[PDB]
Structures are given as structure tokens and as C-alpha cells.
Amino acid sequence: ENTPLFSPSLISPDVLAVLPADYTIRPLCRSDYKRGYLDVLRVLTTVGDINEEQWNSRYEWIRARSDEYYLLVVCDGEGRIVGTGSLVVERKFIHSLGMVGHIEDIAVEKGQQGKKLGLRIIQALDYVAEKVGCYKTILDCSEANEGFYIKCGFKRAGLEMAHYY
Template identity: 85%
Template sequence: MASFVPPSVDNPTKPIVNSTVTLSFPFSPTDYTIRPLRRSDYSRGYLDVLRVLTTVGDIAEEEWNQRYDWIKSRNDEYYMLVVCDGQDRVVGTGSLIVERKFIHSLGLVGHIEDIAVEAGQQGKKLGLRIIQALDHVAAQVGCYKSILDCSEANEGFYVKCGFKRAGLEMAHYY
């Protein structure tokens, strides 16, 4: 099982997930691990996994490093996990972004985003494991709920993960 380190209210820089977190899954022919995103995941296929989900663009390594450092500096807001195969190649990912609210007694809401699994790795319950790990993190940091947006085609997957339809997504693109 993964070892999670809960954040401290007095020390928000203490990570919820330490850098040595691993979670092994009993899948053949290789084992998979789930861990926090690392700077070096640029060269391990992280962006290629995101391309399964949506347009990523051509991101240079220097740009990656700048964005990674910005996100890492907000480690009490962004929890980005990756699934790696036996060769330490990124084959899945998902993120939890924690929103601070005035409602619900200054409650926290977890936004689950960017769930993606490499096409050749789909069907192995890796997406489910990512959702379960992010749900665990959300509960550990004190979120009163987690929400996500998905296409109708993916609704069944998220229902199996314990989510239910709770409204209608609206978007205004720029």
C-alpha cells in the first residue's frame, strides 16, 4: 500500500505524498507504481500520456521545468500523480487541485483533473487506481468533496469509481 504523509496545518509545505511513495499492482507482465510527478517525468513520457486526453502542444523542456517548479511550489494545492510501468515509463496520470472556499466553514473542494492512461495500458484498472489514490489524498487534506468533469462517454467509468452525476458542466472558452 502507498504511504501517505498528511500535511500539517502549521506546515503547509510538508507534502501529503512523500517522494518515495510507491504502490505496486499485481498485474503481469510488469508491476506498476504510483507516485508524485517528478521533474524527470518530462523524459519518461508524461506529456505523451496527456496527449491521449487532449491537445498538449509542443512544450520544450525549459518550459516544462518552469511550470513544474511553479506547481511544486504550491504543493498544498496541486497533487499530481503518475503511474509508471516496470521500466519507470509514465503510463498514466491524474491530478487533484484543492480549492479553498468560504462556504462549508472554509471548506476545501478537490477537483480531479487530467485522468489519462496510455492507450496500450487501458483496461488494466490503472485509471481506477489513480482515482482511488487521488480520492485518498483529498480525504487526507480535508476536502469535503471531490468533483470532476467528464464526457458522457466516460460517465460509466466514473460511476464505477464511486462518483455520481451532480449537475451540468458549463464552459466559456477563450
Template identity: 75%
Template sequence: MNDTTTPTTAIPISNPNAPTQNDALNSTQDNTSLFSSSLISAEVSSRLPEGYSIRPLRRSDYNGGFLPTLKVLTTVGDISEEAFTTRYDFMATRNDTYYILVVCDENNIVVGTGAVVVERKFIHHLGMVGHIEDIAVAKNQQGKKLGLRIIQALDYVAEKVGCYKSILDCSEANEGFYVKCGFKRAGLEMAHYYEQSPSTS
């Protein structure tokens, strides 16, 4: 008697822990830079301590020491990863305006950061000005000239994208440091602070 049983096809068992296509996509997005790494000065990079690197901010830096480093400078607040990502994505869609870079140690942990924000003007033939902001270096990394390298890198970015000058605000105690970075006193900073709820936009 012939066996007429229809052969069955083996059904592969999926591994629930295996990375999915979405995981790979998210990983790629997390490692996407805020702006082009071609704007990072090779000369500045070469002057960092051995094993250190300087690069544009990434989404993944939320878990890589970025916010703790900023806390050395000022109040940061309790920022969720979702809120961080929302702000990052806002800046990423305007990557000709926001340039935030980070310095990482030999373990790829963020230990320094700074930003230059490009302001577009009508004066000076539709000129652009780079506002250098939020320079911070982790306390256990100070004394390695990381702050100097960050300023130099941001100044390079501002010049490369077409700014006719870059400016910053600092305390009198830090004036000497910024003079060494090539800046000079040019006026007086004024501020008017407003009481308002933290922005989530």
C-alpha cells in the first residue's frame, strides 16, 4: 500500500530575542549625527588626549553621559528620553542652525560638550552670527584642555558654515580663558529672565 501522506514543511521558530528590522532602524537612527561630521576640525581632533574623540551629538548620547555633563554647567531638569528625543529631532530638522558637539573619553562616554547656534540677520549683507553656548566639561576631566578644544571646534564650525563672527557670554572670572581662545571683550551682557513652566516643545 502506497503512503499518500502529504509531506509537511518545517516552520522556522522565531527567536523572540533576535533583533528585528525596527531594532536595526532605531539603532541606526540613534547613531545618526545631529550635523555632518565633516564640520569637525581635524586639527582640533588631533590635539585631544589619546583615546578621546570629538563629534556631533547623537540621540544615543541621552544614555551616554550628555545630560550629566551639562549639569556641571547649570540646572538641566528631569528630562525623559522621550522629551530628549523630541528636542533632538526638532534640532535635527534645523541642522543648519543647531550645532552641538560632544567630547568622548576612551570608553565613549560624553565628558564635554558645547554648542553654536547660527543666527541669520538682515545686517552685514544678510550675515550670520554664531552664538557659542553651553560649554561644559565633566569635573573629573577638567585640566585636560577639553574646554579649549571645544571652543576651537565650535569656532571652526561657525567659520565653515559662513558666520562673519562668533560671540559668547561669560563671567569676568572666565574672561582670561576666552581671551586665550581668541575672543575679546566686546560689550556687556544683559538678561531679562521670565517665570514660566518648563517647555516640552
């Protein structure tokens, strides 16, 4: 219930060292449902209404795949979740059975934006990806937040194409 999703050993010590006083970054755990986690994702897009049972079910699905789904949180001095980020590690046959890190669902509470918390989330996710043996990390962004990813040391590599249902 407070068991971290993945090893705290995968949290970048350099990131931990430069966070603001009393803020932390750490793996998700199941009790994060009760520390404002889904409210943070509302800055991204529609989350929907998810009750605790549905959370517990998806959480255990993700925990059964914790060599694939690396979800971490930023907490303020009061233990409130104020930022989220995901790394999803894709297995391939190409690149000698290579692994690609996919950065997803990056979100910082509006009142907490513009203090480098997104940068720290990206640095932490890039640390995980390198540690577990990804050959690269990629993500999709908008023209409007490309400048954020540039300041995180990402470069334009191609186009995102979509098909909706």
C-alpha cells in the first residue's frame, strides 16, 4: 500500500539533490490515490471519474508490469502530489532486442509550474531509462510545449501522426 511501484534506487540522486527544500521525487505507490494524484493529471487532459476500487485495479495491473511502467511523483513539503511523469519501456526485435523509453503524461499543478519541477521529472525519467538499458527516450509534444522539451535537452526527431475512433 506504501510499497513503492519500483526501486527507489532508480530515482536520480542528482535530481533529489537539486529539488527545492522539503520537495521529493519518488515512485508511485497505491496510497497516492489519497495524496491528490489524479487531480494533478487534470492539467493534461480529461481524466474522468475514477473511484478507489478502479484505481487499485489499474495500480495492480501496472505493478504486475513494473519492468515496463515507471510512474513517479513530485511531492511538496506537505506530502501533496504536485507533479507526475511516466516512463514506459517498449521491447523491440530491432537494435539487438533493444528497448525504447517513452516519456508520457508529464503534469505539474498550475500553481507549482515554472519552478523546474517538469525539468526534474524529465531528468528523473531519463535516468530510469538509461539505468534499465534504453537506447533512447522519445516523447510526443505540441508546438506550444516544444520549448520545454528543448530546455530538457530533447531534439525534434520526427512527426506524431494520429488516427481516432
